[PDB]
Design a protein around this ligand. Structure first.
Ligand SMILES: Cc1cc2nc3c(=O)[nH]c(=O)nc-3n(C[C@H](O)[C@H](O)[C@H](O)COP(=O)(O)OP(=O)(O)OC[C@H]3O[C@@H](n4cnc5c(N)ncnc54)[C@H](O)[C@@H]3O)c2cc1C
Ligand SMILES: Cc1cc2nc3c(=O)[nH]c(=O)nc-3n(C[C@H](O)[C@H](O)[C@H](O)COP(=O)(O)OP(=O)(O)OC[C@H]3O[C@@H](n4cnc5c(N)ncnc54)[C@H](O)[C@@H]3O)c2cc1C
Lengths: 615, 619
């Protein structure tokens, strides 16, 4: 059509939630969802943002933040892990109607908890399927025992919005009955489109800008094809009688806004864009979660995912056969990340994390006991290029920083919707971020060394310690290297002294913590600098806070200085969230659905449409 | 027996030559050869030196103390522990020192031209020789192997490309800058490795009965009389199984000869009373002659290995070392080509004070001495349980005339206690500069090969990731062939690497530029990964006593009579060569000397070696 009641820009979890809830609320309400990626009903599935300028913090790297480019948003790109923020995280939006207790009903509204529940903070009549997957791999349980061994208590639920130090069997966004991944679009959008026809889906359309009024009321939206295949660039305009909603994700929305005339005035002046609203905060304060990976070598008897990732024929054939014939309990019906923890440093440990982190701590964490500092978890395999990986089997300690101090930004460089924006990831531009990440490298390491499967550290993919230091990396025992190439000459030739072998596995071993110097710390810092990467949990470019502090949206997610325009995706978060952020994006979407429901005098219909090929 | 004419301690190449030549000289002369290792007429049979517990063919000396020069490492120097000595535990390479090396012994009768007839006397050169420095009616059979692996031709082409000229012979005592197809210690007719014992000793025992051979016996010391004449030798079994140590003694009517190798002989001497007097007095060993040079000035060739990754179409030795595909059963030493190189005056300017001083004093006026050796191993000379999948080649490079010196000293009169040992690796800073230089050169060579498909980052210096000289690992195109449906190839997540640009034959090449911090990265890499080449020499120097010498110009231990050292330990300075040919030569000269000293005539040609047809006796 040319005119609809509500236009929602972007098919992320947020946009999908808004469009779905609203369209299902009233068959009269005509909403349209404009998405720049392909329809997912059935690489190029992500758009890649690169640091425009080399970062001095990352030792001359240009960090790359890829984000989703498909219907369903990030939820269509992986078998995802289930995590929720701590309650203080929302209570700290300091925004009316967004407190923990405010959002709790909604946290429940969107969940289909298929697990046994250790508390009363989950939901069951929601579209989004949450389960533990097929089966738990033994390495994970091993990880849990070692973790318990060093003071990380086992818990049956670490997502009760209150646990900050604990480990668990990590649940996944995968339906337990059918074994299919739970993206937001099929759960919220396609489910509706199959039973109603007032939800218009317009994919492969990159929203260029918002069309405004004389009184700055959102009147419509102009979109251009997703790829720039023509000599001329042509806008399709579609009007919105009631509401325009921007859900193009953290990297996506501030560009729409800035090229609509909403943003920093000085920039728009530089860019020949008529100014609609002066908001220097648009695109600023970019936040993320910083990932480091510690790769360790394990006994060959261990069940890991490596043959699959290398691509052996009979193993890929066997596992695909199994995920085909019995997805109910199939190992491939998992993300092979079956266990992890949220951890916090002890007042004893704090004494060694420096001025910078102690300031950040005293200020941010000290009074909020439910906020974790770090996340860690065990990947039954090596999350790295296997053509640079020695033969054998691995696990990976996947760890990320929960609430980084560093900030980045993204700003358009042209009014043209097809030009790359200026981007600064911001990774490590605040020194107070090295200290906790460093700590994790240590913590996880300890855990790895206490596992029944641990057979060594992968020297190359670990920090570059001074060889003579007690903290050096010890690689595989001769026994395991012998079982890897039994009839192989060369195993164990010391010629070159290319490694230092571990003493073989004596389960009757008592462990003493590795002692680290300042020099060793500097090695870990360099490693962190060299290899830290995004976690794809981008947020905060269109912050929700008072304008005078640099906000862009209302307590009702209305863009300041306009009417009928809302930003409801992850970009609105004023401060970071201690979680994998899909659950957050869904929650922000649900809240947004509520707000727009209120604004339009609408009553949401629940429960939602039956998700396709689902019970 | 309890009495023989000549006792020889150690069955190495030198010791084998002495025993064989003498026993064959006069059938009446009863000689006995005592070896601390096993007999080498093997049953089962480079991969011959790792401590697997299954290594009984080598003894491992470990640095008593950690080396600050080597960033806290204790270097490990393995030596041969078997009859034939080092010549029995590998597929051997043929190399000769340059003539300046011998001329510089400054010992009468050890000049290059003096020894040349001896050099020919031992060679059975079976490749065509386009010069006049080889022998043809000699025992040790030398050839070029069958055919050359393609990567070697590749390497040679690259070498020429950076100015290392091709030569048909690098072992003519005269070249210091050139490359060649490397010839080996293998008989071309029968395809068998020509170790020194089976060539010189076993040939005699098969035809005569006056050469007694005693294996598994560790010569503990020399028995001296009142005028410090060697009367015999005391030896113990080499496996210290017995609860008590009982010495077996055998007397010597004519001569005692010590040939137990560079790490072995100075110990015998020290437990005999010949050595640092303060030391022995500390060890309650009665002093026979104070010779502080004994056990001192240990020299070697320092090896570093550069591993580079190559294309999968390439034929290398790797699948073999991995053992896969029943190829170990189906199946040269796969080091078929290399070079001797010397730095150009322009390059000298970037090598620093220490080495430039060394250059002015040592190399400047002697144009035939190469500074570095390099060669290509068609496979990765490294632990494959630490190597990413795929195929590799490695630049095997060693320093020809190192400045560092180490030492070895007994720690007790007990023959079964490990001695104090210091490899000495890199304790003279003038040793870093050339190796680093070499690291650079080979890399360039490596970058210019048609098979080169990347550098193995892990095993290369730790260059700053952002430096232009950082290493770029395998290109994505090859990594794809390694795992066609592999879900992880080309994942950028982690930035653990920087991939190399894929192969276009029409590419023009520019030398890599290095900084001072990049130079330091390489100094640290060198310090971290430098290893011996098993070319140990010099612990019992041949020079005037007042300079710290131990032996005569005729190899007699100072302060005694009827005692000689005939092995590599007598070399006063290093030799720009793999040292087997050198060890054989020392042996021949010693045999000659002992021949004159006892009024004997060597019988030439030698006893016919087992498993050979009649020797050609002409090109
Ligand atoms: C590989 C990957 C793995 C992830 N794994 C997890 C996990 O395991 N657990 C977890 O909790 N979270 C995970 N996430 C993140 C999670 O998906 C996001 O945080 C969540 O989806 C946020 O939703 P969003 O709506 O805010 O942004 P998005 O989901 O990114 O929404 C982006 C959508 O809007 C489209 N769009 C963008 N720009 C425009 C434009 N100008 N015009 C029109 N449309 C546009 C986008 O192309 C896309 O369709 C992962 C993300 C990635 C990339
Ligand atoms: C693995 C290896 C590979 C090599 N490859 C090459 C090559 O390819 N090309 C080349 O030119 N050179 C090569 N060499 C070097 C060459 O083999 C030696 O340098 C040469 O043998 C030196 O001879 P030697 O007289 O010093 O006796 P050695 O070979 O050094 O050994 C002397 C003998 O004396 C015995 N012995 C030692 N101590 C005692 C003791 N107390 N009492 C009684 N007996 C004792 C030992 O068992 C030994 O057999 C290699 C060496 C090694 C270890």
């Amino acid at each position: 059509p040319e005119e609809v009641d509500v236009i929602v820009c972007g098919g992320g979890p947020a946009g999908s939630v808004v469009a779905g809830r609203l369209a299902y609320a009233d068959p009269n309400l005509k909403v349209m969802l404009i998405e720049g990626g392909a329809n997912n009903r059935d690489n190029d599935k992500a758009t890649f943002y690169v640091d425009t300028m080399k970062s001095s913090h990352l030792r001359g790297r240009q960090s790359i933040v890829p984000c989703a480019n498909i219907l369903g948003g990030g939820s269509s790109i992986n078998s995802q892990m289930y995590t929720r923020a701590s309650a203080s995280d929302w209570d700290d939006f300091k925004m009316e109607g967004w407190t923990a207790n405010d959002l709790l009903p909604l946290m429940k509204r969107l969940e289909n908890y298929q697990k046994p529940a250790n508390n009363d903070t989950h939901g069951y009549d929601g579209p989004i399927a949450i389960s533990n997957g097929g089966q738990i791999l033994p390495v994970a349980q091993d990880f849990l025992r070692a973790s318990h061994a060093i003071g990380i208590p086992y818990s049956d639920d670490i997502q009760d919005l209150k646990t900050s130090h604990g480990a668990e069997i990590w649940a996944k966004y995968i339906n337990r009955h059918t074994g299919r991944r739970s993206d937001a679009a099929t759960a919220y959008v396609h489910s509706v489109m199959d039973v109603q026809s007032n939800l218009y889906l317009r994919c492969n359309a990159r929203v260029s800008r918002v069309l405004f009024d004389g009184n700055n009321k959102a009147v419509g939206v102009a979109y251009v094809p997703s790829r720039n295949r023509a000599s001329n660039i042509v806008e399709t305009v579609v009007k919105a009688r009631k509401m325009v909603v921007l859900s193009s994700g953290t990297l996506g929305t501030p560009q729409i806004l800035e090229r609509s005339g909403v943003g920093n005035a000085e920039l728009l002046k530089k860019l020949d864009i008529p100014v609609v609203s002066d908001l220097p905060g648009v695109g600023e304060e970019y936040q993320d979660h910083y990932t480091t990976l510690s790769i360790y070598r394990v006994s060959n008897e261990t069940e890991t995912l490596d043959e699959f990732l290398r691509g052996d024929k009979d193993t890929q054939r066997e596992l695909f056969a199994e995920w085909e014939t019995s997805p109910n309990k199939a190992r491939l019906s998992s993300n092979a990340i079956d266990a992890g923890f949220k951890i916090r440093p002890t007042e004893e440990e704090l004494k060694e994390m420096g001025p910078e982190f102690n300031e950040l701590w005293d200020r941010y964490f000290k009074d909020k006991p439910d906020k974790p500092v770090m996340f860690g978890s065990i990947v039954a395999g090596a999350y790295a290029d296997h053509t640079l990986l020695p033969p054998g089997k691995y696990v990976t300690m996947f760890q990320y920083l929960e609430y980084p101090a560093s900030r980045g930004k993204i700003h358009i460089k042209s009014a043209n919707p097809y030009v790359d924006p200026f981007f600064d990831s911001g990774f490590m531009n605040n020194k107070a971020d090295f200290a906790p990440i460093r700590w994790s490298y240590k913590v996880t390491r300890e855990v790895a060394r206490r596992m029944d499967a641990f057979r060594g550290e992968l020297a190359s993919h670990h920090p570059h310690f001074h060889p003579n230091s007690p903290a050096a990396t010890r690689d595989i025992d001769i026994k395991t290297a012998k079982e890897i190439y039994p009839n192989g000459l060369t195993v164990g030739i010391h010629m070159g002294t290319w490694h230092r072998p571990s003493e073989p596995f004596d389960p009757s071993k008592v462990h003493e913590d590795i002692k680290y110097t300042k020099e060793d710390d500097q090695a870990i810092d360099d490693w962190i600098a060299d290899h830290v990467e995004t976690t794809w949990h981008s947020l905060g470019t269109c912050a929700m806070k008072p304008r005078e502090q640099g906000g862009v949206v209302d307590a009702r997610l209305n863009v300041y200085g306009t009417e009928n325009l809302k930003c409801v995706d992850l970009s609105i978060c004023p401060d970071n969230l201690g979680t994998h952020t899909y659950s957050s994006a869904l929650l922000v979407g649900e809240k947004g659905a509520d707000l727009i429901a209120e604004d339009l005098g609408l009553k949401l219909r629940l429960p939602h449409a039956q998700v396709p090929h689902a019970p």
